[PDB]
Amino acid sequence: GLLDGKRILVSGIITDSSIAFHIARVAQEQGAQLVLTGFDRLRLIQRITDRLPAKAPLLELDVQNEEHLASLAGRVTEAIGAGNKLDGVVHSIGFMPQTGMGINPFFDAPYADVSKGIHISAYSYASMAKALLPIMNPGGSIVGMDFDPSRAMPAYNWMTVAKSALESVNRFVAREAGKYGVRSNLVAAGPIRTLAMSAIVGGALGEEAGAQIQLLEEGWDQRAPIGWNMKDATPVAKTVCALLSDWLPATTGDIIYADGGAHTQLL
Amino acid sequence: GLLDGKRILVSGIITDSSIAFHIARVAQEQGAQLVLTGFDRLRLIQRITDRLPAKAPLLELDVQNEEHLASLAGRVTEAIGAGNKLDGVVHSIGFMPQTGMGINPFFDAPYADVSKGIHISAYSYASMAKALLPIMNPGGSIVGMDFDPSRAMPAYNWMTVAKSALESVNRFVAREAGKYGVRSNLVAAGPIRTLAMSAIVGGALGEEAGAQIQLLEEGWDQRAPIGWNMKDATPVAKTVCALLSDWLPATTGDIIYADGGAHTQLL
Amino acid sequence: GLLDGKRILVSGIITDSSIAFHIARVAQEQGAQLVLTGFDRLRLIQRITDRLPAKAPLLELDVQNEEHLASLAGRVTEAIGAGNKLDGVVHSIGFMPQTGMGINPFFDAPYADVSKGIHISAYSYASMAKALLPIMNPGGSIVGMDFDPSRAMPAYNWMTVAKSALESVNRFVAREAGKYGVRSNLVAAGPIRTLAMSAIVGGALGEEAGAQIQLLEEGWDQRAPIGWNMKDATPVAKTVCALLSDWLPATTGDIIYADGGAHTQLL
Amino acid sequence: GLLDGKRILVSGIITDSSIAFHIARVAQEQGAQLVLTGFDRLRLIQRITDRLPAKAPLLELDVQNEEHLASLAGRVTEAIGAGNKLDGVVHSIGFMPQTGMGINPFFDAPYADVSKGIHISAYSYASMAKALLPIMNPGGSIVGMDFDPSRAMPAYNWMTVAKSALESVNRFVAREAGKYGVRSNLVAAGPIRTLAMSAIVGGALGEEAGAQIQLLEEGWDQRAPIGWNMKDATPVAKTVCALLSDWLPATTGDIIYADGGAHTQLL
């Protein structure tokens, strides 16, 4: 197994279609002892997380909560037993109000909405890193989830911007985590049909967008030289796991692209 | 004259060292009729703007003010006389609290600061464009000011993040301005010794940073194949003008690099 | 005029659909005294260049010809009269054998074809700079023609690579040119329907590719936030002029994009 | 083992300081059955390759040799037993005449030298792919060796350009290899002190550059958030192996950076 005896925090599970859930599963299948966090809906997360091939402690973590954040390292230490440190952390957290995505015009997103988006989507990356870097072993690795925001695109809107922040934050976090012998990197994933993502494809965030969501998806698989299955979250998790392994030991401040190579091709 | 009879909004003047000042001057020398906005210190700005080779209306513009924002278009219309439109707008606005720059550690910037920074430095770019696109002529052209945030650097901290956001916002603004026959572009400039930038090199934002500011600055000129004078904001202003001109007519959502070629060179 | 009393070398006219032909025209309209070079078909070029709004000398220039290259500066000096130096040079040259574009498979282009393509398409760019830097005024500007090769694409094949070479060559030329107070830059244009580009859309380089050429071209205009007319070379020429002007004075080793903002958008 | 019972071709061993050697060793420790190719000095490679923890067939491969190329897949077949297919191919081949590197002036490299360089350094990558794609299993992965050429630099010269070709060639190969279920990617490695690399630091390619090599190297480690050890080729090799594994299954046409994070940092 590729993650034997590595202790790993994983945030961002909410359904079994979450990228994070699939990250968790693969992690465990490679021998990792996990520590999970979730947000708001503890009663639901707990029951979802029982499906993972292995029981793992779940802790509450709103990243907008200065307390949850302050207490964090303590409660992680309590969950894994003192004298022990984390080998890897998974940021797979993201949020944007519907005023900043879909058919709803770019200009009409009020800053209170966007800001919160960025707080959760981008800032929390450093917040998590700040809380956990104290309890991280040399060799350790933080990873977060990204969607390629170099070129603008329809619908994705302010969420594109948050991701633009996030890649740049990532780079500063690699400066700090560096000091503890810890890598930080992002995984730029092609689209994944989460429950969330399947709603948008039934009417949720509008009508003009829901066609542009499917158009995006289809064009992804067309540009990807090896192809892209939005219904399979595994190759993204496997990539994540390889950044949590000891096998990319010279890679920090960076973005790995698990996208079937689609960003590398124009048509 | 390169900007004959083009009417152009210019924001971001506060001293005669402001890049925006230098932009306005060169714009006028080129036959542009200007409209100026300032923030907070109107009594000071007004008396600074008398040094420009031509009197030009001065309006109040705090970009965190929903009112100032809503009323802008009309007060501009009033400023230049109805039946006339702007041909060009200059975002040259930016801010970040000293918890998010200089010696002060990256992780110790609380979110209320960082957000405020991004609101002024980045969100405002779309705020402004939303307010001004209605009153902009076909062939029109927006510009914002940029510092190259693709690599992380010491000191520049959360400002870098703000800048990565901005670049991304630019590209969305391009989508919108497009619909009006209007180009959107950024000028990523080398460092310019403003009053603020002389204070940082006198003690302001720490001691460790003040040598890294001078180490950044010296490295810029070294890496620049034509050289870089941080004392001279003219070439930066000239570049902005040429985006305001009619001569880069197929350029939008972009960043032009006024940095003496330093980002194209490693050593 | 924008190029008043600037003397300027232009290469790569062969027809009045040549980007370089349009470059020439716009340059003269702006007041530039030109010096042209042509390849192989001098009798045809001469007669084509009689359509420009001004008579300008014509020189023979094969860029694979070491002699033509060694003698160049001298014949340029003789054309523009001794004691006078060029203020600007335009590379608008490029060539790739059909085994290295269109429907013909990527793997089947033998190296002697690929090499020649790079010789003309990429190496010459420095071969030209090497010849002409000696006789270039401080403040002077070189420019070459580019098509954005950062992502792969169907058909464009080994030309794509020749472009990647040329981008990188550009950045070194910037090092040398800088020693003379001379900028070097590239204009990454969208597709232009030259005579050569209309033949590919008639049947020239296959049948599969010709559909992908039209599909590329159509996607371009669709992606372009201000739009893209592949029948009008003008904006590309204007942009070139702006790099030959005094107005982008701190720009070197770079690529400006005259593509209607299409590379900044995914969909 | 990470590469259990995977069959892998590895090119570019010439000394035990060769990255390729280090690539071979770690691949075997992971359970890969290797097939090696060498150039020109077969008697010396054979005896150097006896040091690898496992005996492996050695074949002759000059990539400038149309025959060697044509006969390749067959001889490989013959080396591993018919009915069997490669799961991996390592391009770790590079060359450039001293007229195109070091203190020797950029402009003085004649095109016969440059072209050879590109032939070996760049074109060959697709040559190899053309030869072996016929005999590669679905799931298979090609990898080549890169030095980040996005910004120019001193000494590195025409090799830089070759690399710029290679990254572009890479992307097209991904197109072709895609059709076989095969991934193509490059690894952008920091500097490795090979034997060749210690010569240059003794006197070989000049005096001015021999300081610029050591200046480059020192800056690399300075810039690297987790640091960079030019005397240890291991982490490079491990990264290579990770791309040869099944753990980056959605990654093609790309560059992974094994450079300690130095290209994501400015200072």
Ligand SMILES: NC(=O)c1ccc[n+]([C@@H]2O[C@H](COP(=O)([O-])OP(=O)(O)OC[C@H]3O[C@@H](n4cnc5c(N)ncnc54)[C@H](O)[C@@H]3O)[C@@H](O)[C@H]2O)c1
């Ligand atoms: N699904 C895709 O197509 C795709 C592609 C690339 C990147 N990503 C990224 O993956 C990450 C998650 O994607 P997903 O598809 O699994 O969505 P998801 O809803 O399954 O996961 C997002 C998580 O954000 C959490 N969250 C929201 N507000 C929070 C707060 N204040 N504090 C802490 N957590 C909070 C939710 O609990 C949820 O678990 C996001 O960053 C997204 O940008 C997704």
Ligand SMILES: NC(=O)c1ccc[n+]([C@@H]2O[C@H](COP(=O)([O-])OP(=O)(O)OC[C@H]3O[C@@H](n4cnc5c(N)ncnc54)[C@H](O)[C@@H]3O)[C@@H](O)[C@H]2O)c1
């Ligand atoms: N100085 C540099 O080295 C450098 C280099 C590249 C880019 N830039 C960018 O150019 C712009 C200005 O640079 P400068 O050196 O002229 O600095 P400056 O301080 O002269 O300009 C910043 C301006 O921001 C304005 N401002 C602050 N808060 C505001 C608000 N709420 N609403 C409206 N305006 C507000 C001030 O009035 C001021 O004129 C910034 O965007 C900056 O990031 C600066």
Ligand SMILES: NC(=O)c1ccc[n+]([C@@H]2O[C@H](COP(=O)([O-])OP(=O)(O)OC[C@H]3O[C@@H](n4cnc5c(N)ncnc54)[C@H](O)[C@@H]3O)[C@@H](O)[C@H]2O)c1
């Ligand atoms: N047409 C497009 O869509 C497009 C798009 C982007 C960039 N470009 C670039 O613009 C440039 C010219 O494009 P174009 O559409 O005008 O094609 P064109 O055929 O009109 O111009 C190319 C020139 O190459 C010249 N040439 C060929 N071999 C030569 C040699 N050995 N020595 C000197 N000159 C030689 C020809 O005389 C010709 O004028 C090329 O560099 C091309 O890559 C073209």
Ligand SMILES: NC(=O)c1ccc[n+]([C@@H]2O[C@H](COP(=O)([O-])OP(=O)(O)OC[C@H]3O[C@@H](n4cnc5c(N)ncnc54)[C@H](O)[C@@H]3O)[C@@H](O)[C@H]2O)c1
């Ligand atoms: N050492 C570094 O600092 C460094 C950094 C980044 C990338 N790289 C890359 O790694 C690869 C090898 O680097 P290295 O330092 O191990 O050098 P090396 O000399 O040990 O490997 C280069 C190989 O090229 C081979 N070769 C030359 N001409 C050939 C031909 N016609 N056909 C087949 N093989 C031929 C040589 O036999 C040699 O084994 C190259 O791609 C190089 O660009 C090296």
Ligand SMILES: O=c1[nH]c(CC2CCCCC2)cc(O)c1-c1ccccc1
């Ligand atoms: O659902 C997403 N999907 C995508 C990719 C989508 C959006 C663009 C159009 C289709 C693909 C990115 C992304 O960041 C998310 C996301 C947003 C908020 C919270 C969790 C996940």
Ligand SMILES: O=c1[nH]c(CC2CCCCC2)cc(O)c1-c1ccccc1
């Ligand atoms: O003064 C600046 N200077 C720089 C360049 C300096 C500072 C970072 C490190 C040295 C170079 C960038 C920048 O965004 C600013 C800036 C900050 C606040 C408001 C407006 C502009």
Ligand SMILES: O=c1[nH]c(CC2CCCCC2)cc(O)c1-c1ccccc1
């Ligand atoms: O004609 C071209 N056209 C384009 C743009 C076209 C080709 C790619 C697909 C559609 C756009 C690029 C290009 O490099 C060329 C070109 C080819 C030979 C010589 C000089 C220039």
Ligand SMILES: O=c1[nH]c(CC2CCCCC2)cc(O)c1-c1ccccc1
């Ligand atoms: O030796 C190299 N060294 C480097 C990195 C060096 C060169 C630039 C300055 C110091 C780092 C790259 C590279 O491709 C090579 C190389 C070139 C040809 C054959 C084998 C190896």
